[PDB]
Amino acid sequence: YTENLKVIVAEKLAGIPNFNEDIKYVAEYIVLLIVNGGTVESVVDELASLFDSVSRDTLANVVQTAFFALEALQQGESAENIVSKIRMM
């Protein structure tokens, strides 16, 4: 599920107004933090230390969506369906 998660995180990032950072890199960094056992708080904390152009509230939304999407994937939800939901929003 790591390759689809990186895509799903990128899709979420792409929808953030005024998001100026390298999306592919931020998505990779997020998935690195999550796959290796981070808590929601520890992942948000780490991202906030790297990117001062993005609010903690926004980072928290992105992180929440990532963990949520991962669980959904594990339960057998399709990555397409998850992407379609993120893009609607």
Author numbering: 6 to 94
Manuscript text:
We also obtained P43212 symmetry crystals of the Nab2 N-terminal domain that diffracted past 1.8 Å resolution in-house. We used the solution NMR structure of this domain as a model for molecular replacement and, after trying a number of different models containing different fragments of the structure, were able to obtain a unique solution using residues 7–82 (corresponding to helices H1–H4). This difference in the position of helix H5 could have been the result of crystal packing or might have been a consequence of partial proteolysis as it was only possible to trace the chain in the crystal structure as far as residue 94, whereas in the solution structure, this helix extended to residue 99. Phe73 in particular was completely exposed on the surface of the protein. Overall, the mutagenesis results are consistent with Phe73 forming a crucial component of the interaction interface between Nab2 and Mlp1 and hydrophobic interactions making an important contribution to the interface.
The Nab2 protein has a modular structure based on four functional domains:23 a unique N-terminal domain of approximately 100 residues, a glutamine-rich linker, an RGG domain, and a Zn-finger domain. Our studies demonstrate that the N-terminal domain of Nab2 is both necessary and sufficient to mediate interaction with Mlp1. The Nab2 N-terminal domain has a fold based on a five-helix bundle that is analogous to the PWI fold found in SRm160 and other nucleic acid binding proteins, although it does not retain the nucleic acid binding function seen in other PWI domains.
